[PDB]
Amino acid sequence: GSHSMRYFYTAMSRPGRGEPRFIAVGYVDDTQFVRFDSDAASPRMAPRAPWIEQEGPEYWDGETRNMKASAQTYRENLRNARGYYNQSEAGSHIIQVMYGCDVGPDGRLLRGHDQSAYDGKDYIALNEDLSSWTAADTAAQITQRKWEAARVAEQLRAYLEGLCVEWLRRYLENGKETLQRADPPKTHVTHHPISDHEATLRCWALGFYPAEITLTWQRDGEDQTQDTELVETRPAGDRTFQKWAAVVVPSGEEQRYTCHVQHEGLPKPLTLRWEP
């Protein structure tokens, strides 16, 4: 149904270790399709998905030039930001940017994003309106004023409404077989006794795409949100993801617990129990 395109930029300074490293990664939903690393032997925007390989020389050359220009701008940004925070020239600092578009099943713009961070804290974000900014502090207000004077928000909105939407629609058609295919999780429940009176029920979900999923445990039809150990969704290495949810139950009460699974790839939410 609905899709997203995102570019993730990391610019990290390393004083005494050369110029800041600039890394850009492009994603369509949970599929990476491009990368650019200034630390590569020969930095270029490089394919990371088969469906992008078909893009011509004008694409790759246009994108490589844009990345090198972005790398230069973010190297200057790191100098400015250090100044805006009255920071030492010895410390290592990080600027991060995440931007892109969300489209619906019709491929129409749902919403646009352009968020920036400085040392892992929010710095400036383009608002849902794609016309104003949210500066996190007085330093980010200086950036705001420079952007409000250059009307950067207009140029962003024009990219986010035009190019971002147009290109993502094209990628979705090119990567039709994978990007528009949801793989449901392969599910099962494991049982591990802890003591004489306790046991762990683990609800597994494997081989699913995209990463978004809901795994919950219910005891007598009541969510066990507090007592549920939920691991972070993890990539398998083959496009797919894995997750588990565990609950510690009293021995003999196993049949009162149900695991609930919600995933895009499933026609209806699954309900599973430990089958001894």
Binding site: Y7, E63, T73, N77, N80, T143, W147, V152, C164
Partner: peptide, 9 residues
Amino acid sequence: LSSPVTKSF
């Protein structure tokens, strides 16, 4: 396709 927009801090 990446943003061709210069974001100078």
